[PDB]
Amino acid sequence: KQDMPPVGGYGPIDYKRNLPRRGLSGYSMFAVGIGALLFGYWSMMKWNRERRRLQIEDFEARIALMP
Amino acid sequence: VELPSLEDLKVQEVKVSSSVLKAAAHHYGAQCDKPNKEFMLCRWEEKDPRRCLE
């Protein structure tokens, strides 16, 4: 008399197949790429030109002496 | 050829280190200006730094 089949309690689990967790698509990408890229170029011309100012300063001490 | 004697040598060389020589290095020549450019003509325009020693 002690056999298995239970009265209730069932799901089931799915046979489904989906995980569309997107994801900033469709022209939202290529937008964070370009602006941060020119931001790095914007970081230039305030350092290389600044080091160029120090570069003439470095060559200044050479020319002032040597007579 | 000829070379001048051991005299007109052994004058007071500025016995300083290179860092303290490059320390000021900017106010030094910026206000003297009388013998140096004349010494440049004495060396650049006229060669043979043996007429040019004084």
| Preceding amide of A23 cis, omega within 30 | yes
List the structure tokens of B38.
């004349």
Distances (CA, A) of A42 to A25, A34, A48, B50: 27, 12, 11, 56
Facing residue for A65 by CB, picked from B25, B37, B40: B25
Cis peptide before A26 (omega within 30 of 0): no
DSSP assigned state of A7: S
Integer Cα distance of B40 and A64 in angstroms: 13
Residue of B nearest to A57 (CA): B26
Min Cα–Cα distance to chain B from A65, Å: 6
Q: Is B28 on the interface with A (CB under 8 A)?
A: yes
Tokens of B49: 């730094």
Contacts of B53 in chain A (CB under 8 A): none
Instruction: Tell me the residue type at A36.
Output: A
Method by which the coordinates were obtained = cryo-EM
Q: Are A65 and B21 in contact (CB under 8 A)?
A: yes
Q: How far apart are CA A44 and CA A50, in angstroms?
A: 9
CA A35 remoteness from chain centre: 11
Q: Is residue A13 within 8 angstroms of chain B, CB to CB?
A: no
Chain A residues with CB under 8 Å of B28 CB are 64-65
